[model samples]
Target: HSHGLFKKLGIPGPTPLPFLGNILSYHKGFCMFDMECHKKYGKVWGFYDGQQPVLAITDPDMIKTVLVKECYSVFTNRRPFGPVGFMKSAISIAEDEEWKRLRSLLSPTFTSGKLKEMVPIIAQYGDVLVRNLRREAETGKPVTLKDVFGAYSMDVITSTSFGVNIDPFFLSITVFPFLIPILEVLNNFLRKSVKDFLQLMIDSQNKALSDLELVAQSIIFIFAGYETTSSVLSFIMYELATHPDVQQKLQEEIDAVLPNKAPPTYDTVLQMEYLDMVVNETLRLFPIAMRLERVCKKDVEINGMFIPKGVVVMIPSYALHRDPKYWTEPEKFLPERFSKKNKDNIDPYIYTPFGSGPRNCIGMRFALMNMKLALIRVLQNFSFKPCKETQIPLKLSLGGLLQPEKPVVLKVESR
Candidate 1:
């Protein structure tokens, strides 16, 4: 309680206790913890990650400044994880000029033309997914949406990029305090495998990419696209099942776009304006990455707040998306807000599900293509209904990403 850092900075927050900081004080989950903190601490507050002090900013203006206005000059890097092995070259951890080089090289792979070419192949995988789901839906048993969607995303990623569970323990270590110690034991096993795999790549370094770089790039590509896309897909289905009015409207949009069983082309799906709104709203409510963070490369003042160099600036996106100041009936699932007519009033910084500026999600377009195609195909053949296992007010648990605490269970029936 005597730590005067927050006092010196003149930032208010729930007080930190000794070595643990505020880490132990938050129990409900980071999303809820962030909301509670925002309510009590206002738009800017202080917290700690381990011993490192962090500044949490929910003010949209400051957010824009941090994530965009000075992204390259000041907030040039994400919080460091001091990654090992293949992760050392992973784009998510790369910094400065190296990050720029990697990002520039990889950017073209997800361009509109490339993604358009991928649609037909991804649609084929979507068909396989629909057939696989049918086998389960026929059982008259509750289907675990996360498992099904997760598998489909894995296959889509594997076929598209050539590459990974919803394990509770696997996720918990990333956020849940209870699992922090287990990381050391698990790392030993992981280190051995990554070392062996990287060695194999090294022995064959005559390829296009340096051995570790190729492996790291491929692994991060699969990891980045896999779980995030699947988690949002699962949540979108849950919302559709629970909100029949929205489901019926979306299905109508899908039907109109593909008259007489016309194949869903890239342009055809884009024409489904309502489908876009549904996807957008789902992303807003359950942004896969609960927060967006950047490290201050040098001391800077944004929106009159003085941030010292080396401080981690955090934007708790989940809380910002639902802030009552920016949203009406924030807790409810409403896709109409994203309609072209109404969406213009929203400030871009407040609704950044894929982040913003030069460092935004690199796979944004590819993930959208994969998601929209799967939703289009799957919805045409199936309709979901809440089963006993489904949670009415969804319960969220977070690790590196937001996920349902329990499997998102629903009953699927032929449309």
Candidate 2:
């Protein structure tokens, strides 16, 4: 039992015990190993999640090879889980032929043309979001950025993901019997032009996505869109609030690109270079999910090391992003780190917040647009200022998930 693990390979890690391998170290913090292992063991090592061998990889060259074009088929599937409901039919979790089929069918919906059409829809929601922030700013009360951004992200997704207000009356009468036809007009995906994605699924010979499968995709979409963008935006606001100079400078860039009365648009905000740098800097600081997981389907060798089939692979982006080996002043918050000149200096596969692969997050483009639209519109209307309750040098806690130990509280001032 000990033959193939860290024991036999001469790979280094913290010591383990019977039936409890390294879990005590894990309970110290879920992603703490990302910092711990790579520091002691170097880029690649063997770890165990309670007797189950997990091969943790932090090297860019190794990561690039695994997710490369030629090796995609071998890594075609996402790691599987148990007792899941919608994931059974959800494209995000489907594997092999089904994954290929669904992705083929769904890819068109998020194309440039379709995404452009949805921009106004996102802009519309950003209007109401600005109003909400103004209301909180008026109350002289400390604002919780996460809670407000959660509402804003939910509203934008609810409007654009489905055409209507998402009321039961619409779902019962309009959605079920005529879902695909309805989706053709509302859902962000629909680039097929000749046929809708769901239609392709329904008509597929080998693996068809039925009506329930269609709805499951929609449900998974709303689920995926909500918390991820909101959390990222909250982190951005927290950073902006703390670094007053960065906040003022970022606002100047936003104002230059977007006038106070000028409406937020798809093209303008999408192309703003400084705003892009701020967003990238925020992602570098706080990736929504700290690590990525994959399972090797067959034995392979890289860097002269033997790797076996069915080994669980953990790509530690959290460590890689902050590793002084890859980043200068890794602990510092400097937006210039992502400037066009310095960005290329960053190694590949190290800054992957959404991951790097053919199987990376499908909604990533939309997610970026969502955050950009809100920040652009909101910054034009108001500026973020720290409140009495705001925490400087933010302390992180595990709410069974990573988060600020204290809520991110800030005040908004009308520009």
Candidate 3:
């Protein structure tokens, strides 16, 4: 009995209804079907995704079977999104031969060598972010650091992805009215509707042109890279502000690692082990993508359970990372958990903020480099304290991926 061959075993499963498969569960609120099923039915359980039979795979061995050995056959294509033309053929949405081809072509651009070359570019943007934050701090006015990070991320991705410069920070910000509204509207709609609309527009053969593709990609990068990093930084600052002793210790480490006269270089960032642990811990508690989806093209087995073909599998990174079975005091924000000794004891598959496998995020290194540099500059220059406006228990935004309900605000004073 293999893990992914549940369908062949004829196990009773949830039935998918028309138009809305198991979407109702998703809509009801943040659902934990993966964890729920794992607790009740053991490692593998049968479920429905939009009327499609799915095997919710939680067992580590089964996940490896689907993602590693049977990657091409079992996880051939990405599930389609509705009505969004820009998303239709993007790397994250592409599958099978197309996926492999595009992935290979784009892979080199994100390699370590390429990232090292882009260090200056990332540092330049980090400088821009620090300067703006300094001005904001001096003025004693509330600043939207999250939005600033979004702008910086947009600029970096534009340069890297398309070799262009579109500064959302300096621009009036009104230029994105049409594009932003469309995304907001689409965010409210179901994924099926979005896919259907994109299909309809394509089939209609309309020839109206707009900078929609560029705008869409820019939005994707900002949301993907900026928002996630912003959340991490926000939480980091919050923790540092609340725990001054930790902040002083981290600041001393940063100072010792990179003295004032020395500019932050690639090697400098790599040497900041404590900062790395802090970032890793933050990501563990607040992963950008709470759940990741993979579609199966072939049957697979793991942990003596069977998964079926054409089933959608989920890896709930957030839940898995926080599970008591894996982490001790999962709610505590302790960076020491990621130390070399403790890291060795932890499961590699568990703390995947950037995901895993060949299809993992291509811009991961770029994102981290930019974040580390920006945080280093800011923390060295000022000490941060949470303002009254800062949300106590951050409310997760239901709209447009995971984001704070209220903006994260902090008071930064010159060190």
Candidate 4:
């Protein structure tokens, strides 16, 4: 073999060790790997994982090639993991033909018409969130926004996915423990299992089938679906509470757009453009999928660098969204940046909170509808202010999805 053009690309990583490859240096937290690599090397770098050579691609143009032109061939197989098997291979983990079929089947469920029908259901949960917050306020105690939002998301996903209403508020404090933990454990295991199984399938080997896969997949619509959105909602509340002026602006927009409405309807929410901008801003700053990964299926040239096949490419949305190249004063929380005039200037791929291309999040509409309904119902009835206990510039929990390390305690007063 010609050793390829990649041989000229840097040192081929900072030397690798046996068994672990570079895994010893890999940080366990989200985006930690990319950050470390960027610090050690420049924007682009290569490293080895066991025997496999992986490349990290951060340049926007290269990302487009991997995600758009070469997506099918590159990501035809879902990358494998160890702890989580393919719980529910909805769209996220599905690959090649299976991925295509599942995506087509699920697309209609998120169309505008279907989402309209879901508004009432989402709004009902919003009401529940408000009521719960009001109760916490009455007690004059700080409330954990993350927990409350997680409960609300759980309720929303349960209703939409399985037609079940799980009251996490009632469940979280109860001694009964219920099936949530079991489901959580199973979900984690299934995700890793699916990754391993997929890899096995790619190697033309058969992996054992576990019954938990179907159960986890069936319920994942609630688990993965709700938790990620709930995290965003928690961060939004944190930001609004911290920024009173922004909070007031959001309130003003809601009141003007949805005046005299006890509970805003689907049509009314569409009119709350500023509120939409606020949510968009929050997602941009704190994306749930902090780092996105894709594989390169064919040789492609980007930013004068050649990415060869079988290389795992990573695009750090958290880093990219904050990159000054695309955003101005990226750390500041300014929803106005999403206004029509400003939005027109932004590159589409620069802000992919739900991701982009064919493999983009299938449930984005559902997630957004529920999030908007929740925000509207809560903002209309109450105002949120951060308490002393709330953590600013939120930290991530060790293994949980990216979320505030501590609960986001907020004091709520009825508007």
Among these predictions, the greatest lDDT belongs to 1
Q: Would you estimate the TM-scores of all the predictions?
A: 0.89, 0.87, 0.79, 0.81
Tens digits of lDDT, candidate 4, 143-182: 8777888888878766665466666232121222243455
Q: Provide the lowest-lDDT 10-residue window in model 3.
A: 168-177
Question: What is the C-alpha local distance difference test score of candidate 4?
Answer: 0.69
lDDT of candidates 1 onward, in order: 0.79, 0.73, 0.64, 0.69
Off by over 4 Å in 3: 1-21, 31-42, 162-223, 398-400
Model 2, span 1-415: residue lDDT tens: 5424767777777776656555557544565667878889887877766565778887677887676642565556655543345446778778777777777777766777767888877777788888888888887788888888888877876667655442123222211323434544452243221132233334442344566567667667777788888888988898888888988898888778776557878898776888888898888878767877777777777656777777677788777778888888987888998888888898768889888777787878888888999888888888888877788888766533567789888888887
Off by over 4 Å in 4: 1-8, 11-17, 39-43, 83-89, 166-217, 298-305, 397-400
Error of 1 at 23 (Å): 0.1
Candidate 4 lDDT at 414 equals 85
The order by descending TM-score is 1, 2, 4, 3
Summarize candidate 3's per-residue lDDT along 246-274 as a digit string, tens digits. Answer: 78888988999888725688889999988
Worst 10 residues of 2 by lDDT: 166-175
Error of 1 at 114 (Å): 0.8
Query: Arrange candidates by lDDT, highest first: which order?
Result: 1, 2, 4, 3
Candidate 2: what lDDT? 0.73
Error of 4 at 385 (Å): 1.3
